[PDB]
Design a protein around this ligand. Structure first.
Ligand SMILES: CC(=O)N[C@H]1[C@H](O[C@H]2[C@@H](O)[C@@H](CO)O[C@@H](O[C@H]3[C@H](O)[C@@H](O)[C@H](O)O[C@@H]3CO)[C@@H]2O)O[C@H](CO)[C@@H](O)[C@@H]1O
Ligand SMILES: [Ca+2]
Length: 128
Protein backbone atom coordinates (compact mmCIF):
# COMPACT_ATOMS: atom_id res chain seq x y z
CA UNK A 1 0.00 0.00 0.00
CA UNK A 2 3.02 2.31 -0.24
CA UNK A 3 2.39 5.33 -2.45
CA UNK A 4 5.21 6.70 -4.61
CA UNK A 5 6.05 10.42 -4.71
CA UNK A 6 9.27 12.08 -5.90
CA UNK A 7 11.80 9.41 -4.94
CA UNK A 8 10.04 8.22 -1.78
CA UNK A 9 7.35 5.71 -0.82
CA UNK A 10 4.74 6.69 1.78
CA UNK A 11 2.60 4.50 4.00
CA UNK A 12 -0.66 5.98 5.22
CA UNK A 13 -1.64 3.84 8.18
CA UNK A 14 -5.03 2.23 8.72
CA UNK A 15 -4.55 1.79 12.48
CA UNK A 16 -3.92 4.66 14.87
CA UNK A 17 -0.97 4.68 17.28
CA UNK A 18 0.80 7.10 19.61
CA UNK A 19 3.58 9.12 17.97
CA UNK A 20 6.36 6.90 19.31
CA UNK A 21 4.58 3.61 18.66
CA UNK A 22 3.94 4.88 15.14
CA UNK A 23 7.63 5.71 14.74
CA UNK A 24 8.55 2.23 15.97
CA UNK A 25 6.20 0.75 13.41
CA UNK A 26 7.81 2.81 10.62
CA UNK A 27 11.28 1.75 11.80
CA UNK A 28 10.18 -1.91 11.67
CA UNK A 29 9.27 -1.29 8.02
CA UNK A 30 12.64 0.26 7.19
CA UNK A 31 11.20 3.80 7.28
CA UNK A 32 10.48 6.78 9.52
CA UNK A 33 7.51 9.02 10.23
CA UNK A 34 7.56 11.44 7.30
CA UNK A 35 9.51 14.69 7.12
CA UNK A 36 8.16 17.54 4.99
CA UNK A 37 10.70 19.56 3.06
CA UNK A 38 8.75 21.22 0.24
CA UNK A 39 5.41 22.80 -0.59
CA UNK A 40 4.85 20.04 -3.14
CA UNK A 41 5.44 17.35 -0.51
CA UNK A 42 3.23 19.14 2.01
CA UNK A 43 0.53 19.26 -0.67
CA UNK A 44 0.97 15.58 -1.50
CA UNK A 45 0.59 14.60 2.15
CA UNK A 46 -2.41 16.74 3.14
CA UNK A 47 -4.28 15.89 -0.05
CA UNK A 48 -3.63 12.18 0.47
CA UNK A 49 -4.64 12.57 4.12
CA UNK A 50 -8.13 13.39 2.86
CA UNK A 51 -9.14 15.50 5.85
CA UNK A 52 -8.06 13.03 8.54
CA UNK A 53 -5.30 13.51 11.14
CA UNK A 54 -1.92 11.78 10.67
CA UNK A 55 1.16 11.87 12.82
CA UNK A 56 4.23 13.00 10.90
CA UNK A 57 7.88 13.05 11.95
CA UNK A 58 7.65 16.32 13.90
CA UNK A 59 8.98 16.19 17.44
CA UNK A 60 10.86 18.41 19.90
CA UNK A 61 14.63 17.97 20.37
CA UNK A 62 17.34 19.58 22.49
CA UNK A 63 17.02 21.72 25.63
CA UNK A 64 15.18 24.61 23.97
CA UNK A 65 12.37 22.39 22.72
CA UNK A 66 13.11 23.23 19.08
CA UNK A 67 11.15 21.29 16.47
CA UNK A 68 12.99 18.53 14.63
CA UNK A 69 12.44 15.67 12.19
CA UNK A 70 12.72 12.13 13.51
CA UNK A 71 14.35 11.06 10.21
CA UNK A 72 17.13 13.56 11.02
CA UNK A 73 16.36 15.95 8.17
CA UNK A 74 17.49 19.35 9.54
CA UNK A 75 14.42 21.32 10.61
CA UNK A 76 14.16 24.66 8.82
CA UNK A 77 12.26 27.06 11.12
CA UNK A 78 12.05 29.73 8.40
CA UNK A 79 10.79 27.57 5.55
CA UNK A 80 8.44 25.62 7.82
CA UNK A 81 6.80 28.63 9.54
CA UNK A 82 4.21 28.59 6.74
CA UNK A 83 3.20 24.96 7.30
CA UNK A 84 1.49 25.39 10.67
CA UNK A 85 -2.22 25.92 11.20
CA UNK A 86 -2.72 29.57 12.30
CA UNK A 87 -1.97 29.74 16.02
CA UNK A 88 0.14 26.59 16.02
CA UNK A 89 2.38 25.41 17.45
CA UNK A 90 0.69 26.51 20.68
CA UNK A 91 1.99 23.89 23.13
CA UNK A 92 -1.59 23.69 24.45
CA UNK A 93 -1.50 22.36 28.01
CA UNK A 94 2.31 22.49 27.92
CA UNK A 95 2.32 18.89 26.74
CA UNK A 96 2.41 19.01 22.93
CA UNK A 97 5.83 17.81 21.86
CA UNK A 98 4.92 15.99 18.61
CA UNK A 99 3.32 17.15 15.38
CA UNK A 100 0.66 15.95 12.92
CA UNK A 101 -1.10 16.92 9.71
CA UNK A 102 -4.56 18.08 10.80
CA UNK A 103 -5.98 20.49 8.22
CA UNK A 104 -6.26 20.11 4.44
CA UNK A 105 -4.31 23.29 3.65
CA UNK A 106 -0.69 24.37 3.29
CA UNK A 107 -1.18 25.49 6.87
CA UNK A 108 -1.74 21.92 7.98
CA UNK A 109 0.32 21.18 11.06
CA UNK A 110 -0.71 21.01 14.71
CA UNK A 111 1.35 20.16 17.75
CA UNK A 112 -0.46 17.63 19.96
CA UNK A 113 0.36 15.37 22.90
CA UNK A 114 2.66 12.54 21.82
CA UNK A 115 0.53 10.02 23.72
CA UNK A 116 -2.65 10.60 21.67
CA UNK A 117 -3.39 7.94 19.03
CA UNK A 118 -3.81 9.04 15.41
CA UNK A 119 -3.25 7.47 12.03
CA UNK A 120 0.32 8.08 10.83
CA UNK A 121 2.50 8.40 7.70
CA UNK A 122 5.80 6.56 7.14
CA UNK A 123 8.35 7.60 4.51
CA UNK A 124 10.95 5.31 2.90
CA UNK A 125 13.42 6.34 0.16
CA UNK A 126 13.40 4.39 -3.09
CA UNK A 127 16.88 2.95 -3.46
CA UNK A 128 17.60 1.26 -6.85
C1 LIG B 1 -5.24 16.90 22.10
C2 LIG B 1 -5.38 17.82 20.92
O1 LIG B 1 -5.49 17.39 19.78
N1 LIG B 1 -5.38 19.13 21.20
C3 LIG B 1 -5.52 20.16 20.19
C4 LIG B 1 -6.94 20.76 20.23
O2 LIG B 1 -7.84 19.73 19.83
C5 LIG B 1 -9.08 19.87 20.50
C6 LIG B 1 -9.99 20.71 19.58
O3 LIG B 1 -10.03 20.16 18.27
C7 LIG B 1 -11.39 20.73 20.14
C8 LIG B 1 -12.41 21.43 19.27
O4 LIG B 1 -13.55 21.74 20.04
O5 LIG B 1 -11.91 19.40 20.31
C9 LIG B 1 -11.18 18.61 21.23
O6 LIG B 1 -11.68 17.27 21.35
C10 LIG B 1 -12.86 17.24 22.11
C11 LIG B 1 -13.97 16.63 21.25
O7 LIG B 1 -14.30 17.49 20.18
C12 LIG B 1 -15.20 16.32 22.10
O8 LIG B 1 -16.15 15.64 21.31
C13 LIG B 1 -14.81 15.49 23.33
O9 LIG B 1 -15.93 15.23 24.14
O10 LIG B 1 -13.86 16.23 24.08
C14 LIG B 1 -12.64 16.43 23.39
C15 LIG B 1 -11.66 17.10 24.35
O11 LIG B 1 -12.21 18.32 24.81
C16 LIG B 1 -9.72 18.49 20.76
O12 LIG B 1 -8.92 17.81 21.71
O13 LIG B 1 -7.03 21.85 19.30
C17 LIG B 1 -6.11 22.92 19.56
C18 LIG B 1 -6.43 24.02 18.58
O14 LIG B 1 -7.74 24.54 18.79
C19 LIG B 1 -4.69 22.40 19.42
O15 LIG B 1 -3.78 23.46 19.69
C20 LIG B 1 -4.47 21.25 20.39
O16 LIG B 1 -3.17 20.70 20.17
CA1 LIG C 1 -1.53 22.52 19.36
Amino acid sequence: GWKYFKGNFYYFSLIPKTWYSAEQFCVSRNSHLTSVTSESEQEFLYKTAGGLIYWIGLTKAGMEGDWSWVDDTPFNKVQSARFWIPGEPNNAGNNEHCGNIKAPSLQAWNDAPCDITFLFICKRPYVP
